[PDB]
Amino acid sequence: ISMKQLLEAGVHFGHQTRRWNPKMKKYIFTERNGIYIIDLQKTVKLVDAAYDYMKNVAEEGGVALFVGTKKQAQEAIKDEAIRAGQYYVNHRWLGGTLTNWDTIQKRIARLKKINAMEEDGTFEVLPKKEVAGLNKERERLEKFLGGIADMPRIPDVMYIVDPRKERIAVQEAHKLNIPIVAMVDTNCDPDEIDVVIPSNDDAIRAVKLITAKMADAFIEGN
RNA sequence: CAUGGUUGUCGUCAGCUCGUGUCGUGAGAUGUUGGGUUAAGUCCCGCAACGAGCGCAACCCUUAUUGUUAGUUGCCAUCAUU
Ligand SMILES: [K+]
Numbered sequence: 001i002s003m004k005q006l007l008e009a010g011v012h013f014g015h016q017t018r019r020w021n022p023k024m025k026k027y028i029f030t031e032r033n034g035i036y037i038i039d040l041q042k043t044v045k046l047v048d049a050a051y052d053y054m055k056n057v058a059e060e061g062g063v064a065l066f067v068g069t070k071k072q073a074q075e076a077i078k079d080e081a082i083r084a085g086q087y088y089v090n091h092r093w094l095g096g097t098l099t100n101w102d103t104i105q106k107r108i109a110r111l112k113k114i115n116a117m118e119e120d121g122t123f124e125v126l127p128k129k130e131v132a133g134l135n136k137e138r139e140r141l142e143k144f145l146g147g148i149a150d151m152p153r154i155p156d157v158m159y160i161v162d163p164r165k166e167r168i169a170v171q172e173a174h175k176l177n178i179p180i181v182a183m184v185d186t187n188c189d190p191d192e193i194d195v196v197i198p199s200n201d202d203a204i205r206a207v208k209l210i211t212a213k214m215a216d217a218f219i220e221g222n
Numbered sequence: 223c224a225u226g227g228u229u230g231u232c233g234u235c236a237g238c239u240c241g242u243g244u245c246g247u248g249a250g251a252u253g254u255u256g257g258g259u260u261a262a263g264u265c266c267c268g269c270a271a272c273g274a275g276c277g278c279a280a281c282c283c284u285u286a287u288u289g290u291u292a293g294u295u296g297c298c299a300u301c302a303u304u
């Protein structure tokens with residue numbers, strides 16, 4: 001990935017100065033118009049390191065979980081994870097998604113069961129009220145667990161856009177010792193992320209560019 | 223004031239909890255709170271929770287309309303009679 005490609009996508013824009021994390025100075029180039037400008041020279045080095053790291057993860061056949069619920073990130077991380085063949089969370093992270101995995105599976109299992117009825121003919125002999133109700137129930141589960149519905153186990157790596165926003169996802173990863181690859185903004189804490197990518201979290205073309213490379217890495221490694 | 227069973231009572235009020243997860247040194251907390259809504263912990267949305275059980279509701283009885291089957295010991299519209 002090119003330094004101009006990052007610049008065109010606006011990967012350099014940080015947050016307002018007063019809202020920074022002091023630990024991010026290591027990745028900041030300068031400040032402009034009241035905002036911190038990320039150092040793209042290190043961004044290229046770090047995104048390449050993440051690219052190889054994600055690849056080496058896929059080579060093992062391990063699972064990757066793309067987490068991002070930001071408005072800017074929600075559409076991309078869905079597309080790329082499906083594109084890469086991996087699993088994603090893009091609407092809302094459920095507390096216990098991974099730490100409470102056993103209980104969560106009973107809900108993913110429910111989704112499979114209700115999908116079966118539709119492809120089994122039970123909905124044809126249902127008294128309207130049930131089928132309408134179970135359709136709503138299926139819709140909610142797909143709303144939440146659809147992106148991970150087919151995840152075979154707890155992921156070997158988690159990719160997070162705006163880890164500051166995705167606070168619970170970072171906590172569930174630390175608990176389970178799942179390394180995190182994240183786009184880290186000027187306001188985010190880098191010490192919680194094993195593979196840092198200093199990047200803007202608030203520009204769609206910025207999230208699309210970085211997410212695509214990480215998704216491609218999993219395509220290439222597998 | 224040793225008990226089983228049975229009963230009143232708050233009160234047909236809406237609640238009472240559990241499993242797993244998470245927070246807390248700990249007792250505990252979370253869920254069950256919040257924004258709406260409902261007769262209702264009723265439902266929806268939001269949420270470090272995700273689900274489940276006992277309750278709520280429904281399934282039961284009666285009452286209000288009606289088709290059909292039945293027509294005596296019930297009934298008398300169309301008939302003659304008392
Ligand atoms: K508990």
Ligand SMILES: [K+]
Nearest residue numbers: 288289290291
């Ligand atoms: K009848």
Ligand SMILES: [Mg+2]
Nearest residue numbers: 237238254263
């Ligand atoms: Mg209560």
Ligand SMILES: [Mg+2]
Nearest residue numbers: 263264277278
């Ligand atoms: Mg209830």
Ligand SMILES: [Mg+2]
Nearest residue numbers: 253254255269
């Ligand atoms: Mg709630």
Ligand SMILES: [Mg+2]
Nearest residue numbers: 234278279280
């Ligand atoms: Mg009842």
